[model samples]
Target: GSSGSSGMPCDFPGCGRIFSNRQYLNHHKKYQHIHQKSFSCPEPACGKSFNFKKHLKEHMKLHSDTRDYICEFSGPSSG
Candidate 1:
């Protein structure tokens, strides 16, 4: 196997997960090693946390009635 395939190995203790490039390694460290679920819901009662800020942002939308998750696929024609 070429070294390029698995060149980046997470140096965090007890976590030897490998990555192909620095970009993925940094991303994993930011969310998994350095700060797990760094993003949290602002709602006091929700107590929800997410590894990524974007996920938390999407989750917050559920608190409202906006159909943000609606499917774009058109349904079958009526018989």
Candidate 2:
């Protein structure tokens, strides 16, 4: 809790997330948590999950049989 008289430093709703800065929380929600997913994958073998309709659409392709797909990560690996 960032509520110990250390400023209203919680970004989640009543509290900030990883950032203690108020400006960063604004950055966090719009840049990071907008429409953020709370749903879990049904596959127990692969419990991966995330948010946004676009993200959901992209994720379904892993199990799809359709062709002619382009990789969003087609860019050079960050590593």
Candidate 3:
């Protein structure tokens, strides 16, 4: 007979993820429900933002490439 399990539930309509503490509940709400964009694009003209840091990094890499290769199926013909 094991018992005594308490947790904070996320009542975000379709989602019902539970957290062990109230602090995590608030954290979860901000990220999953509210979607607070902590990471933002440095480019002023772009005006792009992301919730995760890594996502922004990958997007920045896309900017660095600048579409060097236009054709995907051009096959090795020496560029």
Candidate 4:
């Protein structure tokens, strides 16, 4: 029951979906609305595609082979 959950239905033919946020809706429209594959991974051997730029940024991290997730609790990993 969030106040920000406003549905912005896409009018693009064959796409009858709705989104709460405009930014996300735009991404969907930009990509799926026209079935466009604008974002393609430049990583070698991995030709993944994404419609949203932020999604592409997140996908790029997968190629790093790095552990960016660290627990900074400063305590035991138990209750």
Candidate 5:
């Protein structure tokens, strides 16, 4: 027996759940990738909505002076 190829599954890393329809994929992309925050921060300058708390924490780093992501040079970086 073989499963139909129309709605197979989600193959994203750390995510292996099956999606029954295309709508789920659309929702997943928006809520996961777009970073839609339903709650607003009190800080005026840090106004951003987030679907998850962890996203808010990550977003706060942008307001800070710390360089969280550093690239080591093994080869040239991409544009």
Candidate 6:
């Protein structure tokens, strides 16, 4: 019941890869499910596009660090 003996064709468009296990089938659906690539950062100045939320959060950190927001609080301590 854990693994399927027969290969199942990927339902994603243009993806003909086949998987014999339900875990792999779920992974394919989650990672390569859609053709549209919907999860992209909407920031006007940021032209970054990512497939996952973690990547988008990491990209946003780039923008946040550009101005060094922590300096506002830490600068006085250093000097």
TM-score to true structure, per model: 0.35, 0.30, 0.36, 0.35, 0.30, 0.34
lDDT of 5 by residue, 1-79 (tens): 5756656465454456566788988787676645543545546876667778888777777778655456667766899
Per-candidate clashes, comma-separated: 0, 4, 0, 0, 4, 0
User: How well is each residue in 1-74 modelled by candidate 4, as lDDT tens digits?
Assistant: 55654588776533679988889988887776656546778755786878899999998787777554555567
Find the candidate with the highest lDDT and give its number. 3
**Candidate 5 C-alpha error for residue 71, in Å:** 34
- Candidate 3's displacement at residue 47, Å, is 0.7
Q: What tens-digit string does per-residue lDDT give for candidate 1 at 1-79?
A: 6544437777754487988878988988887776542666766788887978889888977887644434445764456
Q: Quote model 5's TM-score.
A: 0.30
User: Model 6, 1-79: lDDT tens per residue?
Assistant: 8975568777644468888887898787887773555456656677667878788888888777656344575457653
> In candidate 4, residue 14 scores what lDDT?
39
Tens digit of per-residue lDDT, candidate 2, span 2-53: 5465434444543345556778767767776775536445556767666566
Task: Tell me the spans in candidate 1 whose CA falls farther than 4 Å from its real position.
Answer: 1-37, 66-79
Candidate 4 weakest ten by summed lDDT: 67-76
Give each model's whole-structure lDDT.
Answer: 0.73, 0.60, 0.78, 0.74, 0.65, 0.71
- Ranking 3 against 6 by TM-score, winner: 3
Superposition error at 12 for model 2 (Å): 18
Worst 10 residues of 2 by lDDT: 7-16
TM-score of 4: 0.35
For candidate 1, the per-residue lDDT at 34 reads: 69
Error of 6 at 48 (Å): 1.4
Q: Tell me how many residue pairs clash in candidate 2.
A: 4
Tell me how far the alpha carbon of residue 16 in candidate 6 is from the true structure, in angstroms, after superposition: 30
Arranged by lDDT, best first: 3, 4, 1, 6, 5, 2
